[PDB]
Amino acid sequence: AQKRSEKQYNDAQNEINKWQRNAQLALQKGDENLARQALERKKTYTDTSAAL
């Protein structure tokens, strides 16, 4: 169970990184809306990771 949680935690970190790439891509694109979605996801994910 702990390993699954660790995997989930690892997945969350990976998910955050993927979201970060999108945010970086959005900046290059110059579209504000794409960037906003990524930021919200990072904050909730970080909180979940801390709890885990």
């Binding site: 945010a23 959005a26 900046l27 110059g30 504000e32 960037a35 906003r36 930021l39 919200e40």
Partner: peptide
């Protein structure tokens, strides 16, 4: 605040 942060990133 997030929008402001994005703008700062955009400037660089």
């Amino acid at each position: 605040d997030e929008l402001a942060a994005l703008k700062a990133q955009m400037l660089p």
